[PDB]
Curated annotation (Swiss-Prot):
It is linked to Pulmonary fibrosis, and/or bone marrow failure syndrome, telomere-related, 6: An autosomal dominant disease associated with shortened telomeres. Pulmonary fibrosis is the most common manifestation. Other manifestations include aplastic anemia due to bone marrow failure, hepatic fibrosis, and increased cancer risk, particularly myelodysplastic syndrome and acute myeloid leukemia. Phenotype, age at onset, and severity are determined by telomere length. It comes from the Eukaryota. As part of the heterotrimeric replication protein A complex (RPA/RP-A), binds and stabilizes single-stranded DNA intermediates that form during DNA replication or upon DNA stress. It prevents their reannealing and in parallel, recruits and activates different proteins and complexes involved in DNA metabolism. Thereby, it plays an essential role both in DNA replication and the cellular response to DNA damage. In the cellular response to DNA damage, the RPA complex controls DNA repair and DNA damage checkpoint activation. There is a cross-link at K25, K91 (Glycyl lysine isopeptide (Lys-Gly) (interchain with G-Cter in ubiquitin)). Component of the canonical replication protein A complex (RPA), a heterotrimer composed of RPA1, RPA2 and RPA3. Also a component of the aRPA, the alternative replication protein A complex, a trimeric complex similar to the replication protein A complex/RPA but where RPA1 and RPA3 are associated with RPA4 instead of RPA2. The DNA-binding activity may reside exclusively on the RPA1 subunit. Interacts with PRPF19; the PRP19-CDC5L complex is recruited to the sites of DNA repair where it ubiquitinates the replication protein A complex (RPA). Interacts with RIPK1. The chain holds residues 1 to 120 of 616 of the full protein. Belongs to the replication factor A protein 1 family. It is found in: Nucleus; Nucleus, PML body. The modification N-acetylmethionine is found at M4. This is Replication protein A 70 kDa DNA-binding subunit. DNA damage-induced 'Lys-63'-linked polyubiquitination by PRPF19 mediates ATRIP recruitment to the RPA complex at sites of DNA damage and activation of ATR. Ubiquitinated by RFWD3 at stalled replication forks in response to DNA damage: ubiquitination by RFWD3 does not lead to degradation by the proteasome and promotes removal of the RPA complex from stalled replication forks, promoting homologous recombination. Sumoylation promotes recruitment of RAD51 to the DNA damage foci to initiate DNA repair through homologous recombination. Desumoylated by SENP6. It comes from Homo sapiens. Changing R46E: Loss of HELB-binding.
Length: 123
């Protein structure tokens, strides 16, 4: 209940970005979800996530998880546990975190607000 930022894995974004730790199962809040421009291929969704301290904009949902967005269980403000993810590095050096398995712990409606005051992580 109280101490809302205590619901999130503070420091997980830095851990993912700095250490490349993939064994952790961090709890993050969805701040925003947006489709990416795609061709005739399945839609892809990019997420702005928060660990309470930082936000990071380079999350992508694995296509297998698209139903979570399209049926609305995964939406802005919800709190999720990431059970499996990988990091991929693009030609230009940018890294993207692909969310492969995730659990919605609290619905957007049950949370209702951005938790804490996270600031953008500097990639
Ligand atoms: C469009 C697209 C889709 C997918 C991947 C990707 O890296 N996929 C994977 C890579 C490795 C393993 C698994 C996967 C997986 O998707 O399951 C990259 C791109 S992109 O670079 O051309 N544009 C883009 C990148 C990031 C963000 Br935020 C927004 C747009």
């Amino acid at each position: 209940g109280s101490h809302m930022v205590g619901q999130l894995s503070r420091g997980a974004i830095a851990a993912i970005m700095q250490k490349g730790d993939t064994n952790i199962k961090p709890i993050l809040q969805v701040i925003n979800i947006r489709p990416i421009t795609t061709g005739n291929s399945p839609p892809r969704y990019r997420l702005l996530m928060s660990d309470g301290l930082n936000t990071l904009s380079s999350f992508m949902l694995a296509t297998q998880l698209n139903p979570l967005v399209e049926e609305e269980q995964l939406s802005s403000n919800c709190v999720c546990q990431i059970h499996r993810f990988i990091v991929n590095t693009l030609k230009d050096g940018r890294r993207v975190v692909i969310l492969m398995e995730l659990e919605v712990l609290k619905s957007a409606e049950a949370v209702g607000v951005k938790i804490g005051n996270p600031v953008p992580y500097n990639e």
